[PDB]
Amino acid sequence: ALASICQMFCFWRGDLVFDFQVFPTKYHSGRLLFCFVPGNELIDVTGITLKQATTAPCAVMDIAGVQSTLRFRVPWISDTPYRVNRYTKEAHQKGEYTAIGKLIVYCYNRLTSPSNVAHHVRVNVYLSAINLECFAPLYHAMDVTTQ
Amino acid sequence: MMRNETRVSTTENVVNLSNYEDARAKMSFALDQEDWKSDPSQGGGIKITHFTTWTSIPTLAAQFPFNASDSVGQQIKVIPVDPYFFQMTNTNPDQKCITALASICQMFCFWRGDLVFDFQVFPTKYHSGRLLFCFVPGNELIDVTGITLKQATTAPCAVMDIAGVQSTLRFRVPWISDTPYRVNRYTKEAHQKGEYTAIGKLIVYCYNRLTSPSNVAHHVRVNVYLSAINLECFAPLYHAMDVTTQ
Amino acid sequence: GASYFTSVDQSSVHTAEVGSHQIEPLKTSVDKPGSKKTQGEKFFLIHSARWLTTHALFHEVAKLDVVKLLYNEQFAVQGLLRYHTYARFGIEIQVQINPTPFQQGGLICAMVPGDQSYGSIASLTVYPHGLLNCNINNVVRIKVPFIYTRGAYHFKDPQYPVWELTIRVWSELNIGTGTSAYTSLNVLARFTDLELHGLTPLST
Amino acid sequence: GASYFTSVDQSSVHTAEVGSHQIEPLKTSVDKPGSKKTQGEKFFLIHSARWLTTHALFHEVAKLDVVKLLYNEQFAVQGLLRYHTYARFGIEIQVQINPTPFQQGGLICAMVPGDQSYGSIASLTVYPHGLLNCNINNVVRIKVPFIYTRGAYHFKDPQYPVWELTIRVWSELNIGTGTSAYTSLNVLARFTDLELHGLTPLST
Amino acid sequence: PVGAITTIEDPVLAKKVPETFPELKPGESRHTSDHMSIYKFMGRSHFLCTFTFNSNNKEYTFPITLSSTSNPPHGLPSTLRWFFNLFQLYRGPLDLTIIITGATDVDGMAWFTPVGLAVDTPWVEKESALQIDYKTALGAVRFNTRRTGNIQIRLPWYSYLYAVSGALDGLGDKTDSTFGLVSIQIANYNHSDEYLSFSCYLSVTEQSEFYFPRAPLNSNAMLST
Amino acid sequence: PVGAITTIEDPVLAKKVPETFPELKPGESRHTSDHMSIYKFMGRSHFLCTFTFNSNNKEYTFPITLSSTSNPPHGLPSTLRWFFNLFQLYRGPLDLTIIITGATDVDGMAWFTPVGLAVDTPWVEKESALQIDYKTALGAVRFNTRRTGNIQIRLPWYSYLYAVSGALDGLGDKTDSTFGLVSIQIANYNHSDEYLSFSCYLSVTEQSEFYFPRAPLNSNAMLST
């Protein structure tokens, strides 16, 4: 939804919201650290220890629990008032960015469990926005971001 | 019964950009035809609105040396009195360093007001001398070389003691002319008796020879800034005033 | 005239200034502007190890010089410690793990000042501690003020670690055949009431 | 609950704490405790070159990216910039020299935003400037707010220098045979109203 | 006469009102408005650029760049150039007005494209490579040479930046130096007809702002087409 | 930070205002109107369709169908398509605006034909098969290429339904998926002349309503002419 809308605008700003839903069993146990690294949609981030990651704003979550969703509200942090929908341009240009940074999902505590339960746990990632603002109408069907 | 008849006046679909009343757009691209507020965010609040902003900032117009070798009453430098003046220039990067005052008035046909010649001395607390600045009312083209330092005192002028705690003399040339405004004739091919750009010429005489010991420069340089107060320009035009090679 | 770095000038003159501080009508960033607390009194991941079935009772799963550990480029607080010589403060530690309910056992986390010396392991509860029990909680928090022999800690060249966080097996971690025979553990630390003193260009 | 780095815990428990903040009855250090201003909004020596008799008129004695220069381990402020991505601010520059009264000439110092482009060197006075005259003053100060196309400067990877401090010969430096044919020059800079945003572990 | 002597090196003393000789009040001007009020001055829409169509069903896309670097015709010319270098930061809408010359009965379209978005290659006449859908979406305008011969529409302050500037270097001078782009696409122009020329002029609006004064371009920089 | 953790499966708890880190009030925008107000947004008449006449005294009749099925050109294209699928029910007048391209001195007529009534075969250029009487009766409009070159008339909410929709299946998707039809018939167009093209654009009106939000079309569905 969020996408299909903003896809028709040249600019946007506000706090994006990443909702994480866990699908475990009351028998698993683990923690995942969500870290937002301020910047642009193209910054090599692979070279960041889980430790280094704590410097930036982030939040850890205990999967095993009565609750099931962590809401990550990424504050609007940028050197510009708004970001642009450069996903229409042929290539990329230093400065013309679409994102205010990248989000990371680290493995805080290894996933433990017995043996009569899945050897993993899936997680749905919902996306929405609050305090959103878009302007400068345009047409473009944003394609899939193949991570 | 609809009855709203209006006659089609002259100048049908004619375009005029001489002013904003006709230059302003008749429609807009902005969605919902919105507008925009003010925003000094990254502007430090320094919002400009008038060209006065430039015509009041003393910019470097010219530099002239005062050598000890210069004798009493010897003309050191002559400068026309019109904002369009400036002679500063740098070799490389190649550029004809125009002044603020100039770069502005250069876009007008007329001007009037009191031009201000600021003189900055670069001596040492060990030199000693005086320079007389004399403004001869007239036009930008009047043979002035035939004027004794004495004769020069008849016209309005001011002497200055270089050696001192102060360093700048401000020469405010009062608007003196037979016309209400002067014209930017620097665009015309030649010159015409009457069509003048300056209200006269300024002179830098050597009031008292420059004295000094021997362990200090044999001269003293002087920067000449130019700006204007009570300035008024009108009649927009385009032209990049060239350098006045004195 | 104010702040550090003073300048004495004989041939003085006035200062030239233009414009003034312009407050964003529309902020370009919604996060609190950097401050001592923003970058210094926040949490950071210090160390992280494992706890197994193999770990016998009282086994020290981790002996950390909390302080010294924080003093490292890896964490932003470094930027404040890297330029000051001495500094006194308080600390808040948070240790967490994730044992599957099919696991059982427990750990004890204690903030011991200086060194454990020859203190009875069985009395580690005397120190600011936090007990972890699989069947109960999976996280614990501890907060302590400044406790030292000196009026401040010297980073560039320390005398002795302010705090030595110790984590030992309070009760062997056993499980039923099939269950994961381990559980990772993490340690979070942060400064409280961070008092910095003496700006220095040194590094070591 | 507050500050950055939030923690969501299912199997929660209370925090254990001992003692409280103890205010020194007899301080162990009399200097203001480190703060954003202490370590960031203070003066630092950026660059320093010479001005000779050889230097012709308008000669650029120094072209500096004030900002970029400050972003360097050499200065403590780095510790605040090294961990934040963006940041807006104001600047106060102070340039000083020491010409012997037997020397004569002058220099002009101007804070030009972005680049000097093709602006008339003769009009550098339009920008926040400071004129130096041997026979008069030997020091000048300039203070300017934030002036940029963007709402903040990106340190890790800048778009274009916020300020380009330029220092040119306003009037050839001549002297009498025997006098020193030169004079060193230094440039001091500092941030004002330093607004930091976005904590980041990056470095480049 | 106290303002006849001062130390210009001192920022304070330099502001002392200059006065050398005795003068009287200048008086009143004979013309209503003050020609030095930037708003009123640039209010006179000045020249920007001009181009000519050669083949049918083609299009031209010229950008509005302050870049002092970009020399005309592929850049800011005459007055416009000069002006947009007297200060460091600019923002606000601009009342563009384009005049059509020559041809007739030629259907045309034009749309404003914000900085940092897809748009046909600059300063070049070629067959458009954009979805008619995309074009229109950004807000467009159709017109016919016969019926009119001139268009005056306002250009929006739609950019992800706080302001733009001309005086810059390479990098920034390639992103933060542009207001936006304009694109005119013709239709039904059998070249068996006369040539088709376009003239574009820009005028500053009341909603336009100017921040921080720079040192005007040295004469050698002021170019003209 | 309490809104940093919740059970999304619960409809109530999911509405808890999210909040993870400490933020300050965003502030004020620099542009007057809010570009996200559907009315103001679609207020920008977007592209609908386009066709070209070949022979003289002929006519084209294109329907206004929301059908997500009907792929363009024989259907809703670009923006219009996308929009009319964000919700389930639509009703209300629509300000259509059609642009003429090419030919000249060509007399033309156009009329709106409500859903479920006699009308020339859709998406097809052929000789009209309707009584001039019938055409006019439904309310028509005459015009000439020379004198104008564009027409902006409103389209009525005349239908026996409460609302129409795009997302539907076969049957209903063939009746309850249409606003109505438009028909343009030319006259005096000796093909010895230039070609005649028509461009149609639609804009939403204040009297237009939108009910119940749907899940936007997946990218693969969003087509464009």
Ligand SMILES: [Cl-]
């Ligand atoms: Cl006619």
